[PDB]
Write a protein that binds this ligand. Structure first.
Ligand SMILES: *[C@@H]1O[C@H](CO)[C@@H](O[C@@H]2O[C@H](CO)[C@@H](O[C@@H]3O[C@H](CO[C@H]4O[C@H](CO)[C@@H](O)[C@H](O)[C@@H]4O)[C@@H](O)[C@H](O[C@H]4O[C@H](CO)[C@@H](O)[C@H](O)[C@@H]4O)[C@@H]3O)[C@H](O)[C@H]2NC(C)=O)[C@H](O)[C@H]1NC(C)=O
Ligand SMILES: *[C@@H]1O[C@H](CO)[C@@H](O[C@@H]2O[C@H](CO)[C@@H](O[C@@H]3O[C@H](CO)[C@@H](O)[C@H](O)[C@@H]3O)[C@H](O)[C@H]2NC(C)=O)[C@H](O)[C@H]1NC(C)=O
Ligand SMILES: *[C@@H]1O[C@H](CO)[C@@H](O[C@@H]2O[C@H](CO)[C@@H](O[C@@H]3O[C@H](CO)[C@@H](O)[C@H](O)[C@@H]3O)[C@H](O)[C@H]2NC(C)=O)[C@H](O)[C@H]1NC(C)=O
Ligand SMILES: *[C@@H]1O[C@H](CO)[C@@H](O[C@@H]2O[C@H](CO)[C@@H](O[C@@H]3O[C@H](CO)[C@@H](O)[C@H](O)[C@@H]3O)[C@H](O)[C@H]2NC(C)=O)[C@H](O)[C@H]1NC(C)=O
Ligand SMILES: *[C@@H]1O[C@H](CO[C@@H]2O[C@@H](C)[C@@H](O)[C@@H](O)[C@@H]2O)[C@@H](O[C@@H]2O[C@H](CO)[C@@H](O)[C@H](O)[C@H]2NC(C)=O)[C@H](O)[C@H]1NC(C)=O
Ligand SMILES: *[C@@H]1O[C@H](CO)[C@@H](O[C@@H]2O[C@H](CO)[C@@H](O)[C@H](O)[C@H]2NC(C)=O)[C@H](O)[C@H]1NC(C)=O
Ligand SMILES: *[C@@H]1O[C@H](CO)[C@@H](O[C@@H]2O[C@H](CO)[C@@H](O)[C@H](O)[C@H]2NC(C)=O)[C@H](O)[C@H]1NC(C)=O
Ligand SMILES: *[C@@H]1O[C@H](CO)[C@@H](O[C@@H]2O[C@H](CO)[C@@H](O)[C@H](O)[C@H]2NC(C)=O)[C@H](O)[C@H]1NC(C)=O
Ligand SMILES: *[C@@H]1O[C@H](CO)[C@@H](O[C@@H]2O[C@H](CO)[C@@H](O)[C@H](O)[C@H]2NC(C)=O)[C@H](O)[C@H]1NC(C)=O
Ligand SMILES: *[C@@H]1O[C@H](CO)[C@@H](O[C@@H]2O[C@H](CO)[C@@H](O)[C@H](O)[C@H]2NC(C)=O)[C@H](O)[C@H]1NC(C)=O
Ligand SMILES: *[C@@H]1O[C@H](CO)[C@@H](O)[C@H](O)[C@H]1NC(C)=O
Ligand SMILES: *[C@@H]1O[C@H](CO)[C@@H](O)[C@H](O)[C@H]1NC(C)=O
Ligand SMILES: *[C@@H]1O[C@H](CO)[C@@H](O)[C@H](O)[C@H]1NC(C)=O
Ligand SMILES: *[C@@H]1O[C@H](CO)[C@@H](O)[C@H](O)[C@H]1NC(C)=O
Ligand SMILES: *[C@@H]1O[C@H](CO)[C@@H](O)[C@H](O)[C@H]1NC(C)=O
Lengths: 250, 101, 200, 450, 100, 50
């Protein structure tokens, strides 16, 4: 994290610095900063354009009106000014629609922004890859920005993979089908105990956090299938340290 | 005829033109047009990207390869699975405008 | 993406007309800048979302695929060697073939005309050249429809990719079972239990 | 603020040491000698230590000469206090950056790399002329030097002006020395016309008028066709003992100062420096498209035809009515040219009758052919001449940066990169895809097809 | 394209013809009429293009979330993945500038 | 849902004006086409909505 924040901050510190545009474009700093650039430019651009519109002598004798009034009789001056009037209002209209377009868009943005802060910031969200990129969004930060906010979504990316063998389930004594109740888990044996000791471990379906399973994590199943591991009752304490053979204890 | 100038490095490193030739000793043919520069080499790194095309800083032109994304292991019920592990937490950037003035 | 030679779209290269246009400041320039900005953006994000996994591409052909009770013949895209420069390609799925050929008035988007022949200028000029001579350029699609298909194939492969490598391409029945247990733990998956869904 | 020189003049006070001098109110700095590459560190900060503006620092402790690149940055950088490329200070390394391209500091031993900051414009002498219009209050300097001949680095608190013959290009034949009593204007009217015919970068436009046809923009940038191509530049400081007939269709016959294009001009621009030239009447005589001759008389009187313009006043004290006598057989009247403005700076005229005055088209009448001068600048009047430079001029499209209705900087459009720039509106342009026109026939020579 | 056909209250849509038929002042006056017409129509084309650009931008966003949260894996968001019901999964095929 | 008879709207119902209107060709058609397209899309999507 310290790495990433600092050297992203460096990415801020310059443009095309060190040719580090492997992180180029969307979801990268350059994309966001560019966007903000056009953001800050656009308002002044539109306003200036609207202002500059009015100098165009829109089909009239002049870009100003009292000259029209003075030079000719009012009736004709009215005639000419009509064209200027129409030009001015029309440009206003086009500007207006453009502005509303912007308002519509940014309104969509803020809607999403409020969603983002809810779903991503105030808690980490299970919806995959939602928080500005794929992977498990641990959390995110936010910083002010011209008319906007920048969001910094922390997401894990594995560096390795553990090729384990998953177990569909168990059938002890070919009698009792016992299976993990929780879909989000995986039962396996791996590491030195992948096949040497068959030490059974349950870990996240999402990621690698192995530990010994518990009978509390299992449940009965009506139908065995050939995928299920054959098992014996004495193997139940072996498979599960948490199993208890009630009959022998009695 | 209309043409495009690849004003990168604050320079016209290349010109996209329907015309076959230009005042460039280097020229590559594209499926839709011609590109003329002082570098027709194979643009490994697009210093600028546009449509499916990328341009290097020397006037080199090429096609931008798609960036492969992070692998997500599809869920299964049994068999062999590569459980992801030893995660580095990277930060992705996302700016959202909040309002117009 | 579409670009325009606003300068010629108005002046058509008429020098005196160009001088007159100069007084209209950057309105034309702002227009063209906005156009290219939108185009470059569009490009950058669409390239961003497009991420393709090679293992998925492996599993993505029909032969590679194991549509166990899942008849994907129209679903998947056929991958064959393309005599076009010795490269192997995966042709788009039969469904997408129907969608394009029957829907697209020209069947496919590769009909995008090169302006190279437009610069040929020997024979008469078509509509594409008519508009190009009006200063209208049609930038080709940022991403290939074939790239789109292979991306979809990558999506499907990742759908059926049970591991980090190609050694974990489980039968799709297993994936269906997993997703079902995700939405609801199964007390009994009979052969009919899965098969009925498959055949329906 | 030229280099004060190593021995000539008063000057001296050469620092040229690791003494790390820190003087205020400095507007010129020069290094005339890095002994190969031995260190040189300059920190130019606003004296009140204001981080709001962009700080400036140059650093080269390494002694690789060509590869001992002076890390240069006009950026909101650490206002370095004692020594070091960053050091302990205020402001972080990347607070705000304007320019940071580390320009290599390779130079000859007697070569001088210098920077001057004045009039909110910056000139840099790092192997070239880097002239820019940019705000600056940078009178704080903290240095580190390695002694090189005792005359390596100096601060410059006063402007020194060197007259250069330039008999030869290069270190040889410049005949450089602080000279002439025509200090400012003749240092602000001369230039070395580029072989293409342009003003060399570094010109400050002491009096140069942008040609606004009706009303002048106070501030901004405009692309327009203005006569910025230079033909046979003539820069004679306060001497015109000449009876001359400037004629179009002919490259103006004079001692062409810079690498002039020997082109028959269509316009001509002045950097006049004495006003009494106008008092010496006959300074403007004219022959127009009709061939009608034309006189110019300026004097306090307002009626040639009711009174004599025999001037009873000298050195103005009255805006002298300029009347313009028609000199054809059936028209011999004095048209009122203009009430003499309080102070003229530059006058430009064009082939097609454009009498242009101080950014204004007073007449811009039908085409002129013979713009003939009789300014009685003879005898002691050879030191009374207002003629200080005159340059034949060809129209050229260029982008002009101006502020406070004062010319700041220029950019021609002939070069394709420059063509795109002037096709755009900003001198600088961004890396992207830009529209462009296929190059037509440079020679128009369009055949007729009917 | 068809805008160039429209002689915007000028005597012709041919700039060179206008120069031919008029003195420079009046010619520049008339050509300005079509100059304005061309510029205006072009502007409207611009805005509508941006309109489409914007909406398709939102569209591709939606597709992106749909693929991530449904295609990449079935969503707990009931009804979200292309309608109500127990959406077990979904499959995507290419389409002109789009996806199924 | 709103539509307009472009032809009579502009031509005031005058065919002699429709002569000139035809010269703008799809200028008239595109308006109404898009209008009805949006209307029908809205109708179908909200019918499926309910
Ligand atoms: C204030 O406002 C007035 C209003 O008229 C301006 O006067 C005009 O200024 C323009 C700006 O340069 C002049 O344009 C020049 O015209 C010259 C004469 O025109 C002939 O040549 C052109 C071009 O060949 C023909 O189109 C025309 O029909 C004439 O035959 C030309 O010599 C100039 O052209 C140069 O460049 C072209 C290439 O573009 C070359 O082929 C030419 O050989 C030449 O090198 C240029 O076109 C215009 O002439 C002025 N009007 C009149 C009546 O002369 C003022 O300039 C303006 N500013 C002030 C007063 O400061
Ligand atoms: C077409 O013309 C251009 C413009 O001259 C050529 O580009 C540049 O050509 C020089 C001359 O060789 C190349 O310089 C070489 O590499 C370095 C650069 O400093 C140095 O060791 C020498 O100067 C050496 O000559 C330069 O790299 C090259 N730049 C490019 C290609 O971007 C070009 O080579 C010409 N030929 C073509 C394009 O086929
Ligand atoms: C966390 O990271 C920050 C970076 O933001 C570190 O703060 C920085 O620490 C330096 C140490 O002095 C501060 O001064 C700088 O020192 C260098 C070296 O002397 C000098 O060259 C610079 O000019 C500057 O004076 C700096 O202001 C400060 N902040 C920055 C760089 O933004 C901090 O040390 C880190 N801490 C941990 C626990 O990781
Ligand atoms: C043009 O530039 C000159 C720069 O020298 C500005 O000052 C004028 O400079 C000349 C130098 O040749 C002075 O001439 C000298 O005048 C004194 C007395 O007037 C005389 O004793 C000397 O022998 C010599 O001839 C001139 O006086 C001086 N002008 C002054 C002091 O007002 C000039 O202001 C610039 N003008 C423009 C319009 O650019
Ligand atoms: C250069 O100037 C000389 C006149 O001598 C100058 O005196 C000073 C003004 C000094 O600054 C230098 O310019 C000169 O030393 C002009 O003619 C030369 O005169 C000298 C005098 O003996 C003679 O030896 C040379 O041969 C002359 N010619 C030269 C130097 O080319 C000369 O016209 C001026 N300009 C040029 C371009 O040389
Ligand atoms: C566990 O025991 C069951 C029951 O014997 C085994 O299931 C048999 O598998 C073979 C393999 O082809 C079939 O021919 C038999 O018909 C199956 N008998 C059944 C289902 O009653 C199973 O193979 C054993 N091992 C595992 C891992 O399940
Ligand atoms: C040069 O650039 C082109 C891209 O336009 C690449 O094209 C290859 O050219 C060789 C020449 O014989 C062919 O055999 C290959 O099949 C081409 N590759 C493809 C994918 O079609 C080429 O790879 C580039 N050269 C490099 C990168 O060294
Ligand atoms: C981090 O990734 C490594 C690489 O697979 C995992 O294994 C390490 O491998 C290196 C290779 O020489 C050994 O030196 C280390 O002892 C191994 N373990 C560790 C903790 O580094 C490693 O397990 C991964 N870390 C985590 C927390 O999963
Ligand atoms: C799986 O799908 C394929 C094609 O999607 C089916 O094969 C086609 O069936 C039609 C039925 O009329 C025949 O006309 C075609 O000749 C068949 N082959 C093609 C289109 O290549 C097939 O029947 C489906 N079921 C399977 C294979 O069990
Ligand atoms: C995962 O897939 C592989 C291939 O489909 C299965 O087969 C093993 O492949 C590896 C090579 O990668 C060999 O070393 C093993 O000997 C193979 N297994 C057997 C039983 O021979 C593999 O079993 C699967 N499961 C894993 C790797 O845990
Ligand atoms: C910052 O990013 C670049 C590019 O990925 C990387 O090479 C560098 O090591 C990173 N630095 C830190 C401190 O994370
Ligand atoms: C002044 O004008 C006369 C003709 O009017 C001309 O012969 C002479 O060359 C001009 N100049 C001088 C200095 O007499
Ligand atoms: C113009 O110049 C040409 C060539 O220099 C010459 O032949 C012609 O006579 C000149 N005409 C005038 C009116 O100066
Ligand atoms: C004065 O006018 C006559 C004819 O109008 C002409 O021949 C003569 O050249 C003019 N004077 C000068 C100095 O050119
Ligand atoms: C001046 O012009 C008029 C107009 O034709 C003419 O009648 C008269 O003779 C001219 N004056 C002369 C030639 O002195």
């Amino acid at each position: 994290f310290n790495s990433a924040i600092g050297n992203i901050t460096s990415a801020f510190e310059s443009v095309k610095e060190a040719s580090s545009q492997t992180s180029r474009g969307l979801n990268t700093v350059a994309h966001a900063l560019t966007k903000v650039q056009e953001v800050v430019n656009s308002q002044g651009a539109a306003l200036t354009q609207l202002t500059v519109q009015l100098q165009h002598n829109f089909q009239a004798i002049s870009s100003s009106i009292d000259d029209i009034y003075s030079r000719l009789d009012p009736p004709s001056a009215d005639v000419q000014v009509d064209r200027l009037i129409t030009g001015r209002l029309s440009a206003l209209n086009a500007f207006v629609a453009q502005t509303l377009t912007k308002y519509t868009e940014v309104q969509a943005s803020r809607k999403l922004a409020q969603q983002k802060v809810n779903e991503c910031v105030k808690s980490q969200s299970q919806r995959y890859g939602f928080c500005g990129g794929d992977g498990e969004h641990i959390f995110s930060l936010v910083q002010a920005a011209p008319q906007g906010l920048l969001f910094l979504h922390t997401v894990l990316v594995p560096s390795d993979f553990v090729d384990v063998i998953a177990i569909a389930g168990l059938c002890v004594n070919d009698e009792i089908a016992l299976t993990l109740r929780e879909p989000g888990l995986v039962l396996f044996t791996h590491e030195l105990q992948n096949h040497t000791a068959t030490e059974y471990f349950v870990s996240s379906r999402r990621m690698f956090e192995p530990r010994k399973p518990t009978v509390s994590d299992f449940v009965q199943i009506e139908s065995c299938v050939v995928t299920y591991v054959n098992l014996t009752r004495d193997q139940l304490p072996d498979v599960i340290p948490d199993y208890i053979d009630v009959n022998k204890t009695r | 005829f209309s043409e495009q100038a690849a004003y990168v490095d604050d320079d016209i490193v290349g010109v996209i033109s329907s015309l076959s030739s230009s005042t460039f000793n280097s020229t590559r043919e594209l499926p839709g047009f011609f590109y003329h520069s002082n570098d027709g080499s194979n643009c490994t790194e697009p210093v600028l990207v546009y449509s499916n095309i990328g341009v290097c800083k020397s006037g080199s032109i090429g096609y931008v390869p798609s960036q492969s994304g992070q692998v997500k292991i599809a869920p299964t019920v049994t068999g062999n699975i590569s459980i992801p592990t030893n995660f580095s937490m990277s930060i992705r950037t996302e700016y959202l405008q909040l309002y117009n003035t | 993406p579409v670009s325009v030679d606003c300068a010629t779209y108005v002046c058509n290269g008429n020098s005196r007309c160009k001088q007159l246009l100069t007084q209209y400041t950057a309105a034309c320039k702002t227009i063209e800048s906005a156009l290219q900005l939108s185009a470059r953006l569009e490009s950058v994000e669409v390239n961003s979302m497009l991420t393709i996994s090679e293992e998925a591409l492996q599993l993505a052909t029909i032969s590679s695929f194991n549509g166990d009770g899942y008849n994907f013949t129209n679903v998947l895209g056929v991958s064959v060697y393309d005599p076009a420069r010795g490269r192997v390609v995966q042709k788009r799925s039969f469904i997408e073939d129907l969608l394009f050929n029957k829907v697209v008035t020209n069947g496919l988007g590769t009909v995008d005309e090169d302006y190279k022949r437009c610069s040929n200028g020997r024979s008469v000029a078509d509509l594409v050249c008519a508009q190009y001579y009006s200063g209208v350029m049609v930038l080709p699609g940022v991403v290939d429809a074939e790239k789109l298909h292979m991306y979809s194939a990558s999506l499907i492969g990742g759908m059926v990719l049970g591991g980090f490598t190609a050694a974990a391409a489980l039968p799709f029945s297993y994936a269906v079972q997993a997703r079902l247990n995700y939405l609801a733990l199964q007390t009994d998956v009979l052969q009919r239990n899965q098969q009925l869904l498959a055949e329906s | 603020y030229l280099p004060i020189g190593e021995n000539q003049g008063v000057n001296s006070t050469w620092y040229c040491a690791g003494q790390h001098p820190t003087a205020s109110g400095v507007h010129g700095i020069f290094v005339s000698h890095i002994r190969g590459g031995h260190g040189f560190e300059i920190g130019i900060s606003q004296e009140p230590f204001d981080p709001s503006g962009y700080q400036l620092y140059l650093h080269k402790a390494t002694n690789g000469n060509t590869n001992a690149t002076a890390r240069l940055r006009i950026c909101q950088f650490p206002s370095i206090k004692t020594l070091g490329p960053t050091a302990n200070n205020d402001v972080t390394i990347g607070r705000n950056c304007l320019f940071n391209k580390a320009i290599p500091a390779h130079m000859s031993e007697h070569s001088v790399v210098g920077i001057t900051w004045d009039n909110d414009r910056v000139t840099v002498f790092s192997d070239k002329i880097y002239y820019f219009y940019f705000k600056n209050d940078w009178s704080r300097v903290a240095t580190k030097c390695y002694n090189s001949g005792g005359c390596a680095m100096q601060y410059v608190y006063e402007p020194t002006y060197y007259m250069l013959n330039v008999t030869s290009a290069g270190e040889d034949g410049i005949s450089y020395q602080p000279c002439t009593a025509n200090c400012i204007g003749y240092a602000a009217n001369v230039f070395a016309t580029e072989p293409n015919g342009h003003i060399p970068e570094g010109f400050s436009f002491n009096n140069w008028f942008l040609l606004s046809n009706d009303s002048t923009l106070v501030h901004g940038k405009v692309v327009s066709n203005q006569p910025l191509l230079v033909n046979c530049l003539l820069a004679i400081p306060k001497i015109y003992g000449l009876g001359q007939f400037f004629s179009f269709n002919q490259t103006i016959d004079g001692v062409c100062n810079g690498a002039a294009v020997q082109r028959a001009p269509e316009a001509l621009r002045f950097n006049i420096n004495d006003t009494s030239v106008i008092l010496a009447e006959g300074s403007i005589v004219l022959h127009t498209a009709l061939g009608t001759n034309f006189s110019f008389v300026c004097s306090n009187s307002s009626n040639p035809h009711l009174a004599t313009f025999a001037i009873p006043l000298g050195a103005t004290q009255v805006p002298y009515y300029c009347f313009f006598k028609v000199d054809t057989y059936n028209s011999t009247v004095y048209k009122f040219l203009a009430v003499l403005p309080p102070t003229v700076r530059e006058i430009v005229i064009t082939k097609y009758g454009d009498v242009y005055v101080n950014g204004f088209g007073y007449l811009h009448l039908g085409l002129l052919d013979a713009v003939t001068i009789n300014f009685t600048g003879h005898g002691t009047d050879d030191d009374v001449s207002g003629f200080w430079t005159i340059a034949s001029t060809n129209f050229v499209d260029a982008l002009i940066e101006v502020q406070g209705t004062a010319i700041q900087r220029i950019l021609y459009c002939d070069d394709p990169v420059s063509q795109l720039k002037c096709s755009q509106v900003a001198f600088d342009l961004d890396d992207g895809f830009y529209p462009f026109s296929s190059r037509n026939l440079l020679s128009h020579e369009q055949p007729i097809s009917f």
